[PDB]
Coordinates of C-alpha atoms in Angstrom, one line a residue:
Chain Y
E1 CA 114.3 73.9 98.0
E2 CA 115.2 71.7 101.1
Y3 CA 115.0 74.5 103.6
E4 CA 111.5 74.5 102.3
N5 CA 111.4 70.7 102.9
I6 CA 112.7 71.0 106.7
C7 CA 110.3 74.0 107.0
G8 CA 107.3 72.0 105.6
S9 CA 108.3 68.5 107.6
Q10 CA 108.3 70.7 110.9
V11 CA 104.9 72.3 109.6
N12 CA 103.5 68.7 109.1
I13 CA 105.0 67.5 112.7
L14 CA 103.6 70.7 114.3
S15 CA 100.2 70.3 112.4
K16 CA 100.2 66.7 113.6
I17 CA 100.3 67.7 117.1
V18 CA 98.1 70.7 117.0
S19 CA 95.4 68.6 114.9
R20 CA 95.2 66.3 118.3
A21 CA 95.0 69.3 120.9
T22 CA 92.0 69.3 123.0
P23 CA 90.2 73.2 122.1
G24 CA 90.7 75.5 124.8
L25 CA 94.1 73.8 126.8
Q26 CA 96.1 77.3 126.6
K27 CA 99.6 75.3 126.5
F28 CA 99.3 74.5 123.0
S29 CA 99.2 78.4 122.3
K30 CA 103.1 78.4 121.6
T31 CA 102.4 75.2 119.6
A32 CA 99.7 77.3 116.9
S33 CA 102.4 79.9 117.0
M34 CA 105.5 77.8 115.9
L35 CA 103.0 76.4 113.3
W36 CA 102.0 79.6 111.8
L37 CA 105.6 80.9 112.4
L38 CA 107.3 78.1 110.3
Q39 CA 104.4 78.0 107.8
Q40 CA 104.9 81.6 106.9
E41 CA 108.4 80.7 106.9
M42 CA 107.9 77.7 104.2
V43 CA 105.9 79.7 101.7
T44 CA 108.8 82.7 102.4
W45 CA 111.5 80.3 101.5
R46 CA 109.0 79.4 98.2
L47 CA 109.0 83.2 97.3
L48 CA 112.6 83.5 97.5
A49 CA 113.4 80.2 95.5
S50 CA 111.2 81.6 92.4
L51 CA 112.0 85.2 92.3
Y52 CA 115.5 85.2 92.6
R53 CA 115.9 82.4 90.0
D54 CA 114.1 84.9 87.5
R55 CA 116.0 87.7 88.5
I56 CA 119.5 85.7 87.9
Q57 CA 118.5 84.2 84.8
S58 CA 117.2 87.4 83.1
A59 CA 120.4 89.0 83.9
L60 CA 122.4 86.3 81.8
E61 CA 119.7 86.6 79.0
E62 CA 119.3 90.1 78.7
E63 CA 122.6 90.7 76.1
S64 CA 121.1 88.0 73.4
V65 CA 117.2 88.7 73.0
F66 CA 116.7 90.7 69.4
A67 CA 113.1 89.4 69.2
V68 CA 110.5 90.1 66.1
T69 CA 107.0 90.4 66.3
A70 CA 104.8 88.3 63.7
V71 CA 102.0 90.4 62.1
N72 CA 99.8 87.4 62.2
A73 CA 100.1 86.6 65.8
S74 CA 97.2 85.3 67.9
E75 CA 96.5 86.6 71.6
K76 CA 98.4 83.4 73.2
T77 CA 101.4 84.4 70.8
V78 CA 101.6 88.0 72.1
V79 CA 101.4 86.8 75.6
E80 CA 104.1 83.8 74.8
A81 CA 106.3 86.9 73.6
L82 CA 105.3 89.1 76.5
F83 CA 106.3 86.8 79.3
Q84 CA 109.8 86.4 77.5
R85 CA 110.0 90.7 77.0
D86 CA 108.7 91.7 80.3
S87 CA 110.3 90.9 83.8
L88 CA 107.7 92.7 85.6
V89 CA 104.6 90.8 84.5
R90 CA 106.8 87.7 85.0
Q91 CA 108.1 88.6 88.6
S92 CA 104.0 89.9 89.0
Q93 CA 103.1 86.3 87.7
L94 CA 105.4 84.2 90.1
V95 CA 103.6 86.1 92.9
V96 CA 100.1 85.1 91.8
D97 CA 101.8 81.2 91.6
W98 CA 103.0 81.6 94.9
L99 CA 99.8 83.1 96.6
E100 CA 97.9 80.6 94.7
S101 CA 100.2 77.6 96.3
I102 CA 99.5 78.9 99.7
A103 CA 95.6 78.5 99.2
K104 CA 96.0 74.9 97.5
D105 CA 98.4 74.0 100.3
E106 CA 95.1 75.0 102.7
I107 CA 92.7 72.8 100.9
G108 CA 94.9 69.6 100.3
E109 CA 93.0 66.3 100.5
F110 CA 89.4 67.7 101.3
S111 CA 87.6 68.5 97.9
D112 CA 85.1 65.1 97.9
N113 CA 84.3 65.6 101.3
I114 CA 81.6 68.0 100.6
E115 CA 77.9 67.0 101.3
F116 CA 75.3 68.9 99.3
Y117 CA 71.4 68.5 99.9
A118 CA 70.9 68.2 96.1
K119 CA 72.4 64.6 95.0
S120 CA 70.4 63.7 91.6
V121 CA 69.5 67.2 89.7
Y122 CA 70.8 70.7 89.5
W123 CA 68.0 72.7 92.0
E124 CA 66.3 69.5 92.6
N125 CA 64.4 71.0 95.7
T126 CA 62.7 73.7 93.3
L127 CA 62.4 71.4 90.7
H128 CA 60.5 69.0 93.0
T129 CA 58.4 72.1 94.3
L130 CA 57.6 73.2 91.1
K131 CA 56.3 69.6 90.0
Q132 CA 54.5 69.7 93.3
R133 CA 52.4 72.8 92.3
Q134 CA 51.9 71.2 88.6
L135 CA 49.9 68.4 90.6
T136 CA 46.1 69.5 90.6
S137 CA 46.4 68.0 94.5
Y138 CA 48.4 71.1 95.8
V139 CA 47.0 72.4 99.0
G140 CA 50.4 73.8 100.2
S141 CA 51.4 77.9 100.7
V142 CA 52.6 79.3 97.3
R143 CA 55.8 80.3 98.4
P144 CA 57.1 83.0 95.7
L145 CA 59.7 81.0 93.7
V146 CA 61.2 80.7 90.3
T147 CA 58.8 79.3 87.8
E148 CA 61.6 78.6 85.3
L149 CA 65.0 76.4 85.6
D150 CA 67.6 77.8 83.5
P151 CA 70.7 79.4 85.1
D152 CA 69.0 82.9 84.8
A153 CA 65.6 82.4 86.2
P154 CA 66.6 83.9 89.7
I155 CA 68.2 87.1 88.1
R156 CA 65.3 87.7 85.0
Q157 CA 62.2 86.7 87.2
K158 CA 64.1 88.3 90.1
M159 CA 62.5 85.3 92.2
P160 CA 64.0 83.2 94.9
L161 CA 64.9 79.3 94.9
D162 CA 64.2 77.3 98.0
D163 CA 65.9 77.3 101.1
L164 CA 67.9 73.8 100.6
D165 CA 68.9 74.4 96.8
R166 CA 69.7 78.3 98.1
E167 CA 72.3 76.9 100.8
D168 CA 73.9 74.4 98.3
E169 CA 74.4 77.4 95.6
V170 CA 76.2 79.3 98.3
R171 CA 78.1 76.2 99.4
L172 CA 79.4 75.7 95.9
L173 CA 80.1 79.0 95.0
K174 CA 82.0 79.4 98.0
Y175 CA 84.1 76.0 97.1
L176 CA 84.5 77.5 93.5
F177 CA 85.7 80.3 94.7
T178 CA 88.2 78.8 97.0
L179 CA 89.3 76.4 94.2
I180 CA 90.1 79.5 91.8
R181 CA 91.7 81.5 94.6
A182 CA 94.2 78.4 94.7
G183 CA 94.8 78.1 90.8
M184 CA 92.6 75.1 90.9
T185 CA 90.3 76.4 87.8
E186 CA 90.2 73.1 86.3
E187 CA 89.1 71.5 89.9
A188 CA 86.5 74.5 89.9
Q189 CA 85.0 73.3 86.6
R190 CA 85.2 69.7 87.8
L191 CA 83.4 70.8 90.8
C192 CA 80.7 72.3 88.4
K193 CA 80.7 69.1 86.2
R194 CA 80.3 67.1 89.4
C195 CA 77.2 69.3 90.8
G196 CA 75.5 69.6 87.7
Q197 CA 75.9 73.1 86.7
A198 CA 77.4 71.8 83.1
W199 CA 76.5 75.9 82.4
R200 CA 78.9 76.9 85.0
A201 CA 81.4 74.4 84.2
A202 CA 81.4 76.0 80.4
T203 CA 82.0 79.6 82.2
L204 CA 84.7 79.0 83.7
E205 CA 86.7 78.5 80.3
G206 CA 85.6 82.3 78.5
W207 CA 89.2 83.6 79.8
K208 CA 91.5 81.5 77.7
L209 CA 93.7 83.2 75.0
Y210 CA 92.7 82.6 71.3
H211 CA 95.1 80.8 68.8
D212 CA 94.8 78.9 65.6
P213 CA 98.4 77.5 64.9
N214 CA 97.1 76.9 61.5
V215 CA 97.0 80.4 60.7
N216 CA 101.1 79.8 59.8
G217 CA 100.7 76.5 58.2
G218 CA 101.4 73.6 60.3
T219 CA 101.5 70.0 59.0
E220 CA 98.4 68.2 60.3
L221 CA 94.9 69.6 61.3
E222 CA 96.1 70.8 64.5
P223 CA 93.7 72.2 67.5
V224 CA 92.5 76.0 67.7
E225 CA 92.3 77.1 71.2
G226 CA 90.9 79.7 73.4
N227 CA 88.0 82.1 72.8
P228 CA 88.0 84.7 69.7
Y229 CA 85.4 86.7 71.7
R230 CA 87.7 86.6 75.0
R231 CA 87.2 90.7 75.3
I232 CA 83.2 90.7 74.8
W233 CA 83.2 87.6 77.3
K234 CA 85.3 90.0 79.7
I235 CA 82.9 92.6 79.1
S236 CA 80.0 90.0 80.0
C237 CA 81.8 88.8 83.0
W238 CA 82.4 92.6 84.5
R239 CA 78.4 92.9 83.8
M240 CA 77.9 89.6 86.3
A241 CA 80.2 91.3 89.0
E242 CA 78.3 94.4 89.4
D243 CA 74.8 93.6 89.7
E244 CA 74.1 93.3 93.6
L245 CA 71.7 90.3 92.5
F246 CA 74.8 87.9 92.1
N247 CA 76.4 86.4 95.0
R248 CA 79.9 88.0 96.4
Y249 CA 81.3 84.8 95.4
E250 CA 79.9 84.9 91.6
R251 CA 80.9 88.0 91.5
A252 CA 84.5 87.6 92.7
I253 CA 84.6 84.3 90.3
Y254 CA 84.0 86.4 87.1
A255 CA 86.0 89.4 88.5
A256 CA 89.1 87.1 88.8
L257 CA 88.8 86.6 85.3
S258 CA 87.8 89.9 84.1
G259 CA 90.3 92.2 85.9
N260 CA 87.5 93.7 88.1
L261 CA 89.7 94.4 91.7
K262 CA 86.7 96.4 92.5
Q263 CA 84.3 93.5 92.9
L264 CA 87.3 91.1 94.1
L265 CA 88.1 92.8 97.1
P266 CA 84.6 92.3 98.5
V267 CA 85.7 88.7 99.2
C268 CA 89.3 88.9 99.8
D269 CA 89.7 88.1 103.3
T270 CA 93.3 87.7 104.3
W271 CA 96.6 89.4 103.8
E272 CA 97.5 86.9 101.3
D273 CA 94.0 87.2 99.6
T274 CA 94.2 90.9 99.4
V275 CA 98.1 90.9 97.6
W276 CA 96.6 88.0 95.5
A277 CA 93.9 90.1 94.5
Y278 CA 96.1 93.4 93.3
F279 CA 98.7 90.7 91.8
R280 CA 96.4 88.7 89.6
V281 CA 94.7 91.9 88.4
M282 CA 98.0 93.7 87.9
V283 CA 98.9 90.8 85.5
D284 CA 95.3 90.6 83.6
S285 CA 95.6 94.3 83.0
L286 CA 99.1 94.4 81.8
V287 CA 98.2 91.5 79.3
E288 CA 95.0 93.3 78.2
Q289 CA 97.6 96.5 77.5
Chain N
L1 CA 94.9 85.8 45.2
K2 CA 95.2 86.5 48.7
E3 CA 96.3 84.2 51.4
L4 CA 98.1 81.0 50.0
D5 CA 99.5 83.6 47.8
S6 CA 101.6 85.0 50.7
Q7 CA 103.6 82.0 50.9
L8 CA 107.0 82.2 49.3
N9 CA 107.4 78.6 49.3
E10 CA 105.3 75.6 47.5
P11 CA 101.8 75.5 49.7
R12 CA 101.2 72.3 51.5
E13 CA 98.0 70.4 50.3
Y14 CA 96.9 70.6 54.1
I15 CA 97.2 74.6 53.6
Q16 CA 94.8 74.6 50.7
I17 CA 92.5 72.4 52.5
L18 CA 92.1 74.6 55.1
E19 CA 91.9 77.7 53.2
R20 CA 89.3 76.3 50.8
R21 CA 87.4 75.6 54.4
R22 CA 88.1 79.1 55.5
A23 CA 86.7 80.8 52.1
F24 CA 84.0 78.5 51.9
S25 CA 82.9 79.1 55.7
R26 CA 82.7 82.6 54.4
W27 CA 80.3 81.9 51.1
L28 CA 77.9 79.8 53.4
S29 CA 77.3 83.3 55.2
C30 CA 77.6 85.6 52.3
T31 CA 74.6 83.0 50.9
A32 CA 72.3 83.4 53.9
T33 CA 72.8 87.3 55.2
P34 CA 69.9 88.8 53.3
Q35 CA 67.4 85.9 54.1
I36 CA 68.7 86.3 58.0
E37 CA 68.3 89.9 57.8
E38 CA 64.7 89.9 56.3
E39 CA 64.0 86.7 59.1
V40 CA 65.6 88.7 62.1
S41 CA 63.3 92.3 60.9
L42 CA 60.4 90.1 61.1
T43 CA 61.1 87.7 64.4
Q44 CA 62.9 90.3 66.6
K45 CA 59.8 92.2 68.1
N46 CA 57.8 88.8 68.5
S47 CA 60.1 86.1 69.3
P48 CA 64.3 87.1 69.8
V49 CA 64.7 83.2 70.8
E50 CA 64.1 82.8 66.4
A51 CA 66.4 85.8 65.4
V52 CA 69.1 84.6 67.6
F53 CA 68.5 81.1 65.9
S54 CA 68.4 82.8 62.6
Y55 CA 71.6 84.6 63.0
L56 CA 73.6 81.5 64.4
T57 CA 72.4 79.6 61.0
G58 CA 74.5 82.2 59.3
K59 CA 77.3 82.0 61.8
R60 CA 76.6 85.4 62.8
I61 CA 77.5 84.6 66.6
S62 CA 78.5 88.4 67.6
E63 CA 75.3 89.5 66.5
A64 CA 73.4 86.8 68.3
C65 CA 75.3 87.4 71.4
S66 CA 74.4 91.0 71.1
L67 CA 70.9 90.6 70.8
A68 CA 70.6 88.2 73.6
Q69 CA 72.2 90.8 76.0
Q70 CA 69.5 93.2 74.5
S71 CA 66.7 90.7 75.1
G72 CA 67.4 89.9 78.9
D73 CA 68.8 86.8 78.1
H74 CA 72.2 87.1 79.3
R75 CA 73.1 83.5 80.0
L76 CA 72.3 82.8 76.9
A77 CA 74.4 85.5 75.5
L78 CA 77.4 84.0 77.7
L79 CA 77.0 80.6 76.4
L80 CA 76.6 81.6 72.8
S81 CA 80.0 84.0 73.3
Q82 CA 82.2 80.8 74.1
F83 CA 80.8 78.5 71.2
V84 CA 83.5 79.3 68.9
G85 CA 86.3 76.4 69.6
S86 CA 86.1 74.5 73.2
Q87 CA 84.2 71.2 72.3
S88 CA 83.8 70.8 76.2
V89 CA 80.8 72.9 76.1
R90 CA 79.5 71.0 73.0
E91 CA 79.5 67.9 75.5
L92 CA 78.2 69.6 78.2
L93 CA 75.3 70.7 76.3
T94 CA 75.1 67.3 75.3
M95 CA 74.8 65.8 78.9
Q96 CA 72.5 68.6 79.7
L97 CA 70.4 67.7 77.0
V98 CA 70.2 63.9 78.1
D99 CA 69.4 64.7 82.2
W100 CA 66.4 67.5 80.9
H101 CA 65.0 64.5 78.8
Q102 CA 65.5 61.4 81.2
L103 CA 64.3 63.7 84.2
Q104 CA 61.3 65.0 82.1
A105 CA 62.2 68.5 82.6
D106 CA 62.6 69.4 78.7
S107 CA 58.9 69.4 78.2
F108 CA 59.2 73.0 80.8
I109 CA 61.7 74.7 78.3
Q110 CA 60.8 76.4 75.1
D111 CA 61.0 74.1 71.6
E112 CA 62.9 77.1 70.0
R113 CA 65.4 77.5 72.9
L114 CA 66.3 73.6 72.9
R115 CA 66.5 74.2 69.1
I116 CA 69.5 76.2 70.0
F117 CA 70.7 73.9 72.7
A118 CA 70.6 71.3 70.3
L119 CA 72.6 73.0 67.4
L120 CA 75.0 74.0 69.9
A121 CA 75.2 70.5 71.4
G122 CA 76.1 69.4 67.8
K123 CA 72.8 67.8 67.4
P124 CA 71.0 68.0 64.0
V125 CA 67.6 66.2 65.4
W126 CA 66.7 66.0 69.0
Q127 CA 64.1 63.6 70.9
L128 CA 62.0 64.8 73.5
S129 CA 60.0 63.2 76.3
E130 CA 56.8 64.2 74.8
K131 CA 58.4 62.2 71.5
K132 CA 58.1 65.2 69.7
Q133 CA 61.3 65.8 67.6
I134 CA 63.4 69.3 67.4
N135 CA 64.9 69.0 63.6
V136 CA 67.4 72.0 63.5
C137 CA 67.7 72.0 59.8
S138 CA 63.6 72.4 59.7
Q139 CA 62.2 75.1 57.5
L140 CA 65.7 76.2 56.2
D141 CA 67.1 76.5 52.7
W142 CA 69.8 74.1 51.3
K143 CA 72.6 76.6 51.9
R144 CA 72.2 77.3 55.6
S145 CA 71.0 73.2 55.8
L146 CA 75.0 72.4 54.6
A147 CA 76.5 75.1 56.6
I148 CA 75.1 73.5 60.1
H149 CA 76.8 70.6 59.0
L150 CA 80.2 72.6 58.2
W151 CA 79.9 74.6 61.4
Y152 CA 78.0 72.6 64.4
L153 CA 77.7 69.2 63.5
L154 CA 81.7 68.5 62.5
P155 CA 85.1 69.9 64.2
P156 CA 86.9 72.7 63.0
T157 CA 89.6 70.0 61.4
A158 CA 86.9 68.1 58.9
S159 CA 87.3 68.5 55.2
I160 CA 84.4 70.5 52.9
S161 CA 83.8 66.6 51.6
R162 CA 82.9 65.6 54.6
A163 CA 80.5 68.5 55.4
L164 CA 78.7 67.6 52.0
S165 CA 78.4 63.7 52.2
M166 CA 77.1 64.0 56.1
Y167 CA 74.6 66.8 54.4
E168 CA 73.8 64.2 51.5
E169 CA 73.3 61.4 54.2
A170 CA 70.8 64.0 55.9
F171 CA 68.2 64.6 52.8
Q172 CA 68.0 60.9 51.1
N173 CA 66.0 57.5 52.1
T174 CA 68.1 54.8 54.5
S175 CA 66.5 52.2 56.2
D176 CA 67.2 53.5 59.6
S177 CA 67.0 57.4 59.9
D178 CA 64.2 59.8 58.9
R179 CA 65.1 62.6 56.2
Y180 CA 65.8 65.7 58.3
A181 CA 67.8 68.3 55.6
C182 CA 66.0 69.2 52.5
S183 CA 67.6 68.8 49.0
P184 CA 69.7 70.7 47.0
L185 CA 68.1 72.9 44.1
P186 CA 68.7 75.6 41.9
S187 CA 67.8 79.2 43.4
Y188 CA 65.0 79.3 40.6
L189 CA 63.1 76.3 42.4
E190 CA 64.0 77.3 46.0
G191 CA 60.5 78.4 47.8
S192 CA 58.3 77.1 45.2
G193 CA 57.0 74.4 47.5
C194 CA 57.8 71.7 44.8
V195 CA 57.7 68.2 46.3
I196 CA 59.8 66.6 43.5
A197 CA 57.5 63.4 43.3
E198 CA 60.1 60.7 41.8
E199 CA 59.9 61.0 38.2
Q200 CA 59.2 57.8 36.7
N201 CA 61.5 58.9 33.5
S202 CA 64.1 61.0 35.2
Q203 CA 66.5 58.9 36.7
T204 CA 68.7 61.7 37.4
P205 CA 67.2 64.5 40.4
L206 CA 68.0 67.8 39.3
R207 CA 70.3 69.9 41.7
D208 CA 72.1 73.4 41.2
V209 CA 75.4 74.1 39.6
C210 CA 77.1 74.9 43.0
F211 CA 76.2 71.9 44.6
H212 CA 77.8 70.2 41.3
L213 CA 80.8 72.2 41.5
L214 CA 81.1 70.9 45.3
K215 CA 80.9 67.3 44.3
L216 CA 83.4 68.1 41.6
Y217 CA 85.9 69.2 44.6
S218 CA 85.2 66.4 46.5
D219 CA 85.3 64.0 43.6
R220 CA 87.3 64.6 40.8
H221 CA 85.7 62.1 38.8
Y222 CA 82.2 63.2 39.4
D223 CA 79.8 64.2 36.7
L224 CA 80.3 67.0 34.1
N225 CA 77.4 66.5 31.8
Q226 CA 74.7 67.5 34.8
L227 CA 76.8 70.3 35.9
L228 CA 77.3 72.1 32.4
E229 CA 73.4 71.5 31.8
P230 CA 71.8 75.1 31.9
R231 CA 68.9 73.8 34.1
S232 CA 71.4 73.4 36.8
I233 CA 72.0 77.2 36.5
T234 CA 69.0 78.9 35.2
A235 CA 65.0 78.6 34.2
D236 CA 65.5 78.1 30.8
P237 CA 67.5 75.2 28.3
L238 CA 68.4 78.1 26.2
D239 CA 70.9 80.0 28.2
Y240 CA 74.3 78.6 27.3
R241 CA 76.0 81.7 28.8
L242 CA 77.4 79.9 31.7
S243 CA 77.8 76.5 30.9
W244 CA 80.6 77.2 27.9
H245 CA 82.4 79.6 30.5
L246 CA 82.4 76.8 33.2
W247 CA 83.4 74.5 30.3
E248 CA 86.0 76.6 29.2
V249 CA 87.7 77.2 33.2
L250 CA 87.3 73.7 33.8
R251 CA 89.1 72.6 30.5
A252 CA 91.8 75.2 31.8
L253 CA 91.7 73.6 35.3
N254 CA 92.9 70.1 33.5
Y255 CA 89.2 68.4 33.7
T256 CA 89.2 65.8 30.6
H257 CA 86.3 63.9 31.4
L258 CA 83.6 65.3 29.5
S259 CA 82.2 63.4 25.9
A260 CA 83.4 64.9 22.7
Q261 CA 79.3 64.9 21.6
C262 CA 78.8 66.9 25.1
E263 CA 81.5 69.5 24.1
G264 CA 80.0 69.5 20.7
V265 CA 76.5 70.1 22.0
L266 CA 77.6 72.9 24.0
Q267 CA 79.7 74.8 21.7
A268 CA 76.9 74.3 18.8

């Protein structure tokens, strides 16, 4: 952990030199190679500090764990048992947490620097264009567009938005994928909440494992968690991943929450993203099993 | 005989209140299914939105989601599939309705679809920019009206007695709100079209025996006379078959605040 703080301190220093180099000054080639070399070293110390801790704890607990499953267990409590029972699933998630932490540290402070064209409504320019076409003074060209403004209208009508909202939807969907690729799924929800997508702010919850603690008799009216239709919701999210009319990033967003590696790999464009796609679906598939 | 009875310990009042709500959260679907299944048989081929709403008024969320994937309404099906727990979606639709109203965009969405969004958002009435109101309980029977209060207008953590009181707060005159629920009436007076014109002798308005039992469960000192009277049960003032067998269960359940004239009139 101090080796990561030493390497991360020098990555911080070298980043604070490379960010001050004039582009094309060929001397800074070694500065950039030294930055990446110590950034890959930093995250390799991070990887070591997790996996060899688990492998030593397991080898000190394995004489003891004579567990028994409860007949009335929920999805959550089967997985709370799985992550104790299973060092392959546990170490596979420590690789997901590791690879999501790399994507998180490349995002840093930047989330609130995102200018969109829309600034008071969802699909504001298409809404304005429809309200302008409703006026009997419309001597404009009739570009084919959606005539409805629910979030399915583009795929129910198989019609486009106008090209400002159709940039903002593509901008937003990459940022939502980049946040989920960094474990920041609640920031992806807050970005949907911030960009007027109160509907897509909700779709980013439907993967949560079901639980009602009051099935066993608590003491106060304790809260119910998750989705008792999580299976039907994953089937529905897989259906959103495989129609070519959805954006590669919206398909990948629902795929990374429904096991569809086959529609996730079409966006994973680093080595780390490609390892992450396999490990993220390996855990989700073993959890389903 | 089944859930609480699995516990090899004295079952806490909190678990009893919850299993009583879990069981009544079956009964309010079983009292609704045959009318929903006729309503859907008629609506499905003309409007799938009314058929999806009818299923939701009986808690049939799986069938509502299934019909929405069959109709081509897939982002309605997705929205419905998640509504079984997370309060965030109820608040996100609360904002989305406030935005569509303030922006005057509501008046380009179906009133039937806005009725689903209002139900999910836990809004019994919605006020549109046209000055139209969408009452979510409109055209419904008294059981599905009470079921909307038990499932959509309250949390998982409320009592039967709060759902019953919010429903009684919905069908009476106040100084500050219009009525939005129908009145609880015996099954032989349902569908009749009878607007009971505030009878100028009958200071106690007639109700279903099932509503009087829900009052006696909500209040241990609620009336037994209007509960045991045959007019709450049947279209016959001579049929005491259920009246006596209800009293000779309530007397076994240690309810004791009936009058001896009223027991004498029941037994005789």
